[PDB]
């Protein structure tokens, strides 16, 4: 095809994996290219505000233009998904969250809270180790096996007495990776269990999750996972790739 | 330098989330349908773009998400506190938003403890032309692009919602005064005061949303607290 | 007919929750310290009264609760729906309150869905002289008792909070117009419209609490919906 | 002492037990007095608005004056207790409710909801069978054993697969009745457990309860019951009889 656009893209990819910044060196190493031609391409991107330089520190990181490319698109997928959330939420009378992956942590883009007396409540915009959530697992699975080992940077945090370890985690990732859905049982907050499925949108990967008290979970896991799959099918039908 | 052609194309696609015909792309950017086709193909190979079927339409692609996500989820995570702070200094609701065409999008928000309060949900839309936040963002728009959001004739939400004329005129004012406001232009009884955030990742709006009742009195202190917060936030996250 | 003496004593005690000296009780009611002592003793035998130690003070007792509780918890349970209904007809917050001296007490409340909303918690106090609810209740007060709540000189919550004079004058008006209102007399920017509920268990206040912003326009329809609700509720729970 | 005031009082007592109304007959039977002298006393009370007649139906029920006697006092106890609630709530980071008995159902006068993710949420002003709640048990215990058999009108409702039956219920009432506190484990809402203690105020009996997910309850019952007792001691010190 065209090799230089692909070089550029590989560089962007590299920068998006390291939000704090990269040295021209480190960029050059990650991508399979010489510090020189890299410098060239960076410059090209910088001319377009797709990248910025963190001072004479010779560091680089993503730039302004990015926002304006993505914003509308994103604000639309969300706006389109919102209803599909409420629906699900009211079919199951359980809280549901829509999240995206940001390295080792997922990020909650949206959420509907259950009316129930025994309820699970969290705020939009919250972080939480991907390794401990159903959503996090569902996203981690879809990760290219090369990239995966980035999020699984050596050893995992442990949030409860059930939080998986790298081994059982990967092993299970293999399972979700073709079973379609994932779950967590008191692996994040003791007494809470979640059930998530992947959303493959044209804009990237999202996680659709049900978050509920384990108390009530043990009984209806069956119906939960199903409603999730139905919602995945719908949503993707309307917004997939 | 073909990189710049590509970039111009991406820019074009981000302005039209529903999709563009190879033709329309070719026209918007100053390039021939052919070389454009070429570049599209190049991007498509990278999932930076997708084709809406034999419809010959194109729109943004998967890779995008994975580029932006972390960065974004960080700016937000970093700004969140700066919101609470402001919120508690003024005891008024505050929202952080971004522009999506003619509508702003609320990324985050803190609601006032107060008895007479203004309450809205995260993830809400609202015509940019009617909000302080929307004005602050619209101002920063390149004057070429501006006329996109200001497509033809504005909606009118109240008996005060500005019209294209007074709107642009005022945009010129905010565009160097630094901040913007709206007085019962969105919801009657509500007034807002916003300022621009120029982050390395793009433009955001930091806004105070409050009952006009309480606004008429303290506009002065509001605008100031906003500017102080802009200075802080940008000091820590600017470009 | 000694039953009436007793009752007068209870009445006296309910007006002074902190307690009364046998003396003060004797003076308030038109009876001699002696026969009063007698009756107190009789009531005390029934736990309708208690003695605040050798301090010779007296105040209400345990049995009271068990007499009232069920009845009360029923009126409330019966009124709750009538609240929601009203709330959704007007899309404005509504409160059900009772009088406790100079302050009203919010027994229940439904909060408006709206963006510009008024929010308060159940169980809150607020000077009766400043609320529509408070006025509606104060009106129904026997003119003798009234001068108890209107002890000397009123608090002033805003730059509109009435003064004893205009207050009484207006009480005369509500006292046969049926309903009362307050315009930024409690919290600036908030206005309320209340009506009396004459239940078999006592007097309640049914009120709409809303932003003045939105009030100036629809006072008319508010007062009407209130009256309709009063008529219904009383039809089902009046005396 | 004085016998007629006591006759009257007995009548009031009778009426407060039957909020819907009593026939002069039924009143006469409940209290140990003749239909005649009862009629007399009723009349005396009616002159004072302590009672009303439900029409020629010859029925009677409580009256207006009542409210004005109790209101202030009540609105004060509540106002005084409110803080003691928040305090407790924040010491345990669990929801707490203040309730009173209304026959077979308790009535929630006030409540503070936990900040927590797995939380229990209910509205003020709610009813719920006393036989199924810790609060309800605590109040039922304090009931005179004669009166008790009113609330325990034959057979109980059953809210869960754990809701006690009249037998185990009474048996347990004997226990709380000198242990001081009561509890319910998934007897009201499956997954929810509560721990309550009695408040003996000068104005009557109240229930102070902690309501939490059983999940989190099994672990800290111990500390809960203690904080409850401490709060009872405080509150009563300030508002007891």
From Swiss-Prot, chains A, D:
A GO MF label = DNA binding
Q: Which GO terms describe its biological process?
A: negative regulation of DNA-templated transcription
Q: Which SMART domains match?
A: HTH_ICLR
Gene3D superfamilies from the xrefs?
Answer: 3.30.450.40, Winged helix-like DNA-binding domain superfamily/Winged helix DNA-binding domain
Keywords, A to Z?
DNA-binding, Plasmid, Repressor, Transcription, Transcription regulation
Repressor: present as a keyword of the record? Answer: yes
At which residues is the DNA-binding region annotated?
A: 24-47
Q: Which InterPro entries match?
A: GAF-like_dom_sf (IPR029016), HTH_MetabolicPath_Reg (IPR050707), Tscrpt_reg_IclR_C (IPR014757), Tscrpt_reg_IclR_N (IPR005471), WH-like_DNA-bd_sf (IPR036388), WH_DNA-bd_sf (IPR036390)
Q: Which residues form the HTH iclR-type domain?
A: 2-64
Domain (IclR-ED): give its ranges: 77-241
User: What induces or represses this gene?
Assistant: The ttgVW operon is induced by toluene and styrene, but not by the antibiotics carbenicillin, chloramphenicol, nalidixic acid, tetracycline or gentamicin.
Q: What does this protein do?
A: Represses the expression of the ttgGHI and ttgVW operons. Binds to the ttgGHI / ttgVW intergenic region, probably preventing binding of RNA polymerase; ttgV dissociates from this region in the presence of 1-hexanol.
What is the designated name of this protein? HTH-type transcriptional regulator TtgV
Q: Per the UniProt entry, what species is this protein from, by scientific name?
A: Pseudomonas putida (strain DOT-T1E)
UniProtKB/Swiss-Prot annotation, chains B, C:
A molecular function GO annotation:
DNA binding
* InterPro entries according to UniProt: GAF-like_dom_sf, HTH_MetabolicPath_Reg, Tscrpt_reg_IclR_C, Tscrpt_reg_IclR_N, WH-like_DNA-bd_sf, WH_DNA-bd_sf
Give the matching SUPFAM superfamilies: GAF domain-like, Winged helix' DNA-binding domain
| The keyword Repressor is assigned to this record | yes
One GO biological process term is: negative regulation of DNA-templated transcription
Domain HTH iclR-type: from-to ranges:
1-62
DNA-binding span(s): 22-45
* Keywords assigned by UniProt, alphabetized: DNA-binding, Plasmid, Repressor, Transcription, Transcription regulation
Induction per UniProt is: The ttgVW operon is induced by toluene and styrene, but not by the antibiotics carbenicillin, chloramphenicol, nalidixic acid, tetracycline or gentamicin.
Gene3D superfamilies assigned: 3.30.450.40, Winged helix-like DNA-binding domain superfamily/Winged helix DNA-binding domain (1.10.10.10)
Which residue intervals define the domain IclR-ED in the entry?
Answer: 75-239
Q: Which domain of life is it from?
A: Bacteria
Keyword DNA-binding applies: yes
Function, as annotated: Represses the expression of the ttgGHI and ttgVW operons. Binds to the ttgGHI / ttgVW intergenic region, probably preventing binding of RNA polymerase; ttgV dissociates from this region in the presence of 1-hexanol.
Q: Which PANTHER family match?
A: HELIX-TURN-HELIX TRANSCRIPTIONAL REGULATOR, ICLR FAMILY, HTH-TYPE TRANSCRIPTIONAL REGULATOR RV1719
What is the name listed in the Swiss-Prot or TrEMBL entry for this protein?
A: HTH-type transcriptional regulator TtgV
